[PDB]
Structure formats: C-alpha cells, structure tokens
C-alpha cells in the first residue's frame, strides 16, 4: 500500500526501507554527509530472485531488446492515480534517457522469466555528478523501476533495488538520487506538478481535465488561446555552435539552487541538443549575436487506457529554463506557444526552481500528483521546492 502524502506515510512501517542507508521519516536532519562508509569489499554474486526468474543486462543497442523494454514500460509503468493514462516512453526517448555519457550496460538491469525469457522487471542507473548544498558528489540517477503487473506485491522491487545498488557499488559509487510519486524515507524535497492546457477540447474529451465551475467549452478555448508565434526577439532552435554558451548559462544559473546537476559540455550536448519528439531547446540570440537565454522541454506522450485506440495524450514537460536578459515570464510564454505549435495537448511543469513565479500567471492549473526527490546514503536537511534545481525523466 504505497502512500502519497506524508501524513499517510508517517503512520506505516517500511520493512525494506528501514534496512537502507536513508534517514527515517520522523527525522529532522541537521548534518550533511554519508549514512554509511564507502565499502571496500563488495558482494560479487547477484542477489537471489524468486524461483523461475533470472537477471539479464539489456543491450539497448539491440533493437529487439529495446522493443522488449519499450513494451514492458508501455504496459506496466506509471499510471495516474485514477488508472486512466499510462506513460508511453518511446524507444528513441529511452535511448536518450538511458544512454547518456558514461552509461554502462550492467546498469540496465532486467529481470526475465527463466523458461520463456519474457522481460518482467527492470531498473536502471546512469552516472551523474550532483551538487547537494556545499558538496559535489559523483552519484547515479535511478529510474524506470518497473515490475510486470502480474508480478506485483511479491517483493521483487526490493531485489531490483539491492541488485542495482550492488552493481553501482562495484563501480565505486555510493550515493544516488531518484524521484518517485510515492512517499518513502525520506524526501529531500517535495514538488508538485502543474498543467497548462494547450488543446483544451481534447483534454476534456479524454477526461484529463474537466469543464470547471461552469464555464462553457467556448469560454474555455478562448481562455487558453495562445499567440501563433513567440514574442521574444531572436528566439531560435539550439544549434551545435550554441553548446558551449548553453553549458555556460546553465552552470551559472544553477548555482542559486541547493540540489542541481553538474554537467560537462558533452552532457549538455546530450541533454539539450534538439531531437525531434524527444527534446526541444530554443535559445535567445540577441541583436549583438550573443545567446542570453534558453528554454527546453521534453516529449512524453501517454496511452489513454480506457480508449487505447484513440491516439494518445501528447504532453511536453518543462526541462531547464535559464534567463539572464529575457524575463522568465516571457520565456515561458514562448515555451507554451512553441509547444502548442508542435502539437502538444498539455504543458507540464513542476513548482521547483523559480517556476512558482510564472505558473499561476500563465494559467497553469495545480495537479493531483506530487514528485518527491530522494538521496540514497546522503543525510542532509530537506529543502523547499524552489531550491530544487534538478529535473529527471
């Protein structure tokens, strides 16, 4: 029974998470540092799976194996709390998220049925340098934990977690960062998703949103109408020549937050260079030819579970948005217009970084889902959403 608020979570016990190097939910933390020492001998044997299941590292460069992972996630990954929509990460998106600079094949950790070889579980790690308050640490980011619906509630997820932990330890890394919609010991920060309608007619039709407080449909479409072209002078897609200045802009901008990525220039290229239907980045190049701002959002459609025939909910997720000369409000207004132009139905953003300064003004509505941020084997004070400067996939 996963908890979604900390009031529900503070009641229950965590048989697995109590055994792990994370702070207790009750804890107020005032120190900064590891919970347990770096290990100088690591278990060489994989952890034991239930009878009939085996480990398999997934080579995603094999298109057949990538399709197997795509299918596992398409049928069993995260749903909304009403079981009406399920994320539909594309194979090309999965390659973007799972093969960044430094990726390792043993960190694409699958579980297969022994007799049929069917893929029924997965978890992944990717390397990341993380800045947390006054410390920079090489960590991994853990994502795409998924157990087949037919295999749920058999304690397979703790085995997946211990096994990726072991495989990361073997590479000399003893901290991780991750996000989840559920409350576990112990969030370092809690963010909330907000939603900006772009195609309100379709969102109402699929019951992603509802005609609120009796306005007509006519009145709703006019309320959410956007200009057909952006307003900021010099806005254009990011190009190869912009990689260094985007890296420079992002690095200085992120210093004001307390949990942030520390990206090399090669990582900036990976995470921001535009790729159709995966990642969009637009820069502002001013009258002097200098790039002074940039906006970015990634593509994440969702299956409509009750009518899986009726196309899909096309959503854009705000990524990193850096402003030094264009007002952030204007930059995000342009982000909405570009997402509308590109055929997105909704534009999603969290309330982290400086996002609360524009959410209400740009007619975002508050969502029903939280996003909790976590660190593994790092005990530090929690922080408000506006100090979180990290966006995962």
């Amino acid at each position: 029974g996963p908890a979604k608020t900390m009031e529900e979570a503070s009641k229950r016990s965590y048989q697995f998470w109590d055994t792990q190097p994370v702070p207790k939910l009750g804890e107020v933390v005032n120190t900064h540092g590891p919970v347990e020492p770096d290990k100088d001998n690591i278990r060489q044997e994989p952890y034991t799976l239930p009878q009939g299941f085996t480990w398999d590292a997934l080579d995603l460069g094999d298109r057949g194996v990538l399709k197997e992972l795509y299918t596992l996630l398409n049928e069993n990954y995260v749903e909304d709390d009403d079981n009406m929509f399920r994320f539909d990460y594309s194979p090309e998106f999965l390659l973007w998220a799972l093969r960044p600079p430094g990726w390792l094949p043993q960190w694409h950790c699958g579980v297969r049925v022994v007799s049929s070889r069917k893929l029924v579980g997965f978890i992944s790690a990717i390397p990341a340098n993380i800045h947390i308050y006054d410390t920079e640490k090489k960590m991994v980011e853990i994502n795409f934990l998924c157990v087949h619906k037919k295999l749920r509630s058999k304690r397979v997820a703790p085995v997946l977690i211990r096994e990726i932990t072991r495989r990361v330890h073997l590479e000399g890394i003893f901290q991780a960062v991750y996000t989840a919609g559920v409350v576990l010991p112990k969030p370092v920060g809690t963010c909330r998703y907000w939603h900006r309608s772009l195609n309100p007619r379709k969102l109402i039709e699929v019951k992603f949103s509802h005609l609120s407080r009796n306005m007509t449909m006519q009145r709703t479409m006019k309320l959410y109408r956007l200009p057909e072209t952006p307003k900021t002078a010099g806005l254009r897609p990011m190009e190869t020549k912009d990689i260094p200045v985007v890296h420079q802009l992002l690095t200085r901008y992120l210093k004001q937050f307390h949990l942030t990525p520390v990206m090399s220039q090669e990582e900036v290229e990976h995470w921001f260079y535009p790729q159709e239907n995966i990642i969009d980045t637009f820069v502002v190049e001013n009258a002097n030819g200098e790039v002074t701002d940039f906006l970015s959002f990634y593509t994440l459609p969702s299956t409509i579970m009750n009518h899986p025939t009726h196309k899909s909910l096309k959503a854009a997720y705000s990524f990193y948005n850096v402003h030094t000369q264009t007002p952030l409000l204007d930059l995000m207004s342009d982000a909405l217009v570009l997402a509308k132009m590109k055929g997105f139905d909704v534009f999603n953003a969290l309330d982290l970084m400086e996002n609360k300064t524009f959410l209400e003004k740009l007619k975002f509505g508050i969502g029903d889902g939280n996003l909790q941020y976590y660190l593994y084997n790092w005990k530090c004070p929690s922080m408000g959403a506006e100090k979180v400067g990290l966006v995962l996939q």
Partner: peptide, 7 residues
C-alpha cells in the same frame, strides 16, 4: 516520474 493531472 509521477503521472499528474489537474485537480
């Protein structure tokens, strides 16, 4: 990560 929709 988390699938949210408008309240």
């Amino acid at each position: 990560x988390s699938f949210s929709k408008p309240r």
